C-alpha cells in the first residue's frame with residue numbers, strides 16, 4: 001500500500017514533433033517563434049498523483065491516490081479509477097469547483113511549458129497523509145503548496161518514508177520551505193532542470209542535498225538517470241525508445257517504477273532500470289497514461305534489455 | 311482599397327507573465343520547464359488577416375479581408391466584422407467546417423509557440439486575389455500554403471503591389487517557392503527571427519533580399535524596426551509602451567500601420583513610425599484585437615512620440 005500524493009488533473013497536450021532547442025536564436029530579440037499543425041483536440045487523464053498511480057498499477061502494485069478533484073467534471077476520472085481498480089479512499093471531490101487542468105505545450109525533449117488552472121488542487125490540504133492506513137511508502141508530488149507542505153510534515157512525523165518530487169510546484173516554495181521538505185524527505189526524485197532549480201532555491205549543492213536524504217535521483221531524458229547515495233552513485237541507462245511520440249508523463253512513469261522498486265527492496269540498479277523502462281514505454285504513446293503494457297509485457301521487455309526478470 | 315490575405319482565427323493565448331529567455335538552462339538536458347498560473351479562458355478574435363485589417367480599419371484605411379472561416383463558428387467573427395465596419399465580400403465561409411483556432415503559448419518577448427488547428431484555413435485557395443475589384447495595395451500573410459502561393463501569383467499578374475509576410479507559414483515553403491514569392495513581392499515585412507529563417511531557406515543574404523524588393527522591413531520587438539529601401543535605411547524607434555500585457559498580434563498591428571502609410575504616400579520613416587505606434591498601442595492589451603484607440607488618440611500619441619502629424 002503506497003500513498004500517492006499529488007495533483008489529479010485534466011491534460012490538454014500539444015507536442016511539437018521536434019526539439020525547441022534547434023529553433024532558439026539568442027541573437028534575435030525574438031528567441032523562438034514556432035507554429036506547428038495539430039489535429040482535433042483530445043482531453044487526457046493526468047495530474048502527478050494520477051500518472052504515478054497508473055504506472056504503479058500497471059506494475060501490479062497497490063496505489064492509493066491522495067488528492068483533490070472538483071465535482072463538476074470529476075466523474076470521468078472517478079469512473080476510470082473504478083474501471084482500473086484504483087482506490088478512491090483519499091480522492092476528495094469538492095462540490096461546485098473545477099478539477100485542475102493543464103494546458104501543456106512541449107517538444108520531444110520534454111520541455112513542458114504549462115499554463116495551469118489549479119482549480120480543485122488549491123484545496124489539496126483537506127487530505128491528511130498522517131491519517132492514511134497501513135502505508136508502506138509514499139510520494140509527495142506537485143500539488144497545492146499547503147498540501148505539499150502538510151503532506152511532507154505528516155508523513156515524516158509518521159515515520160512513513162517518502163519520495164519528494166516537488167516538480168512543477170517549485171515556484172510555490174522558497175528557500176526555507178524547500179529546505180524543510182527536503183529535510184523531511186527520504187528520497188528526492190527530480191529531472192535535471194528541477195535539480196538546478198532546487199540547488200538554487202535551497203542554496204545547497206547537490207553534495208549537500210545528497211547528504212540529507214537516502215537517495216537523490218536526477219532524470220535526464222534520453223540520457224537516463226543518476227541515483228546518488230553519499231557513498232556511491234548508480235548511472236541508470238535509458239531503454240532505447242521504440243519511437244518518441246510524447247514525453248509528457250515520463251517523469252511520472254519513471255517514479256511508478258522507482259516506487260515499485262523501493263517497496264520490493266530492489267537493488268538501486270534494478271529499481272532505476274525498471275523506472276527507466278517505464279519511461280521508455282510511455283514515450284511511445286501520446287499523453288501521460290496512453291501506454292498500457294501488461295506486466296508480462298513489461299517483464300519481457302526488461303529481460304530483453306537487461307537479461308533478467310524484475 | 312487594401313486586400314488583406316491571411317488567416318482568420320480564434321486565439322487562445324497563454325502569455326507567460328515573464329520571459330522564456332530567463333528560464334532557459336542550456337547546460338541541462340531539459341532546456342526549459344515552466345508551469346504558470348492562468349486565469350480561465352477567453353476565446354479572442356485573431357488570425358493574421360483578421361488582425362491586420364483590424365489595425366488598418368482603426369486608422370480609417372479601407373481593409374478588405376480575404377480569408378476563409380468555418381460555418382460552424384463563423385457567425386461571432388462575422389457579426390463583429392459588421393460592428394467594426396469591415397467588408398465581408400472576400401470572407402468566404404465554408405459550410406460544415408470549423409474556423410481555424412490557435413493555442414498560443416507566449417511571453418512578454420513575443421516568443422509565440424503555437425499549436426494551430428487550421429480547419430477552414432486549409433481551403434483558403436478558394437479565394438482568388440485576381441478577382442478582387444478596385445484594390446491598389448495588398449498583403450499576403452500566413453494562411454494555407456496553396457492559398458498563400460496562389461495570392462502571391464495572382465496579385466503579381468494583376469499588377470497589385472503587395473507586402474509578403476510569410477511569418478508562421480514559413481515551414482510550408484521550400485527554397486524555390488520562397489524565392490519565387492519574394493521575387494513576386496514588392497515589399498517584405500517580417501520579425502527578426504523570421505528574417506533569418508528566410509535567409510537560411512532562400513540562401514540569400516539580407517543584402518541580397520533587399521536588392522529584390524522595394525522595401526525590406528524587419529521588426530525587433532522593443533527595439534523597434536528597420537526599413538531597408540534601396541536609396542536608404544530607416545531605423546524606426548520603438549514607441550515606449552504604456553504597459554506590456556500581451557505582444558500577440560503586435561506584428562499584425564504594425565503591418566496595418568505600414569499599409570495605411572504606403573497607400574497615403576508617407577515616406578518610409580513616417581510610415582514605419584505609425585507602424586511602430588500601432589504595435590505599442592496593441593501591446594498595452596491582452597490579445598491581438600482588444601485595443602480600440604480612436605483616430606484622435608492615435609493622432610495625439612503619434613505627435614507626442616514623434617513631434618509631428620503624418
Ligand SMILES: Nc1ncnc2c1ncn2[C@@H]1O[C@H](COP(=O)(O)O)[C@@H](O)[C@H]1O
Pocket residue numbers: 007009010011045046047048051101102114116142143167168169247248249250251252253288345346
Ligand atoms: N503546477 C502544477 N502542479 C501540479 N501538477 C502539474 C502542474 N503542472 C503540470 N502538472 C501535471 O504535471 C503532469 C506532467 O508531469 P510529468 O509526469 O513530470 O511529465 C501532468 O499530468 C499535469 O497534469
Ligand SMILES: Nc1ncnc2c1ncn2[C@@H]1O[C@H](COP(=O)(O)O)[C@@H](O)[C@H]1O
Pocket residue numbers: 109110191192219220221222223224225237238239240241244247250251254275276277278279280283
Ligand atoms: N527519449 C527518451 N528515450 C528513452 N527514455 C526516456 C526518454 N525520455 C525520457 N525517458 C525515460 O523517462 C525518464 C524521465 O524522463 P524525463 O522526465 O524527461 O527526465 C528518463 O530518465 C528515462 O528513463
Ligand SMILES: Nc1ncnc2c1ncn2[C@@H]1O[C@H](COP(=O)(O)O)[C@@H](O)[C@H]1O
Pocket residue numbers: 035036317319320321355356357358361412424426452453477478479557558559560561562563598
Ligand atoms: N500556422 C499559422 N497559420 C496562420 N496563422 C497563424 C498561425 N499561427 C498563428 N497564427 C495567427 O497569427 C496571429 C499572431 O501573429 P502576429 O500578429 O505576427 O503576432 C494570431 O492571430 C494567430 O491566429
Ligand SMILES: Nc1ncnc2c1ncn2[C@@H]1O[C@H](COP(=O)(O)O)[C@@H](O)[C@H]1O
Pocket residue numbers: 419420501502529530531532533534535547548549550551554557560561562564585586587588589590593
Ligand atoms: N515591448 C514593446 N514595447 C513597445 N513596442 C513594441 C513592443 N513589442 C513590440 N512593439 C512594437 O510592435 C512591433 C512589432 O513587434 P514584433 O512583432 O514583436 O516585432 C515592433 O516593431 C514595435 O514597434
Ligand SMILES: [Mg+2]
Pocket residue numbers: 167168191251252
Ligand atoms: Mg516531473
Ligand SMILES: [Mg+2]
Pocket residue numbers: 492493494495522523
Ligand atoms: Mg521582384
Ligand SMILES: [Mg+2]
Pocket residue numbers: 477478501561562
Ligand atoms: Mg507576424
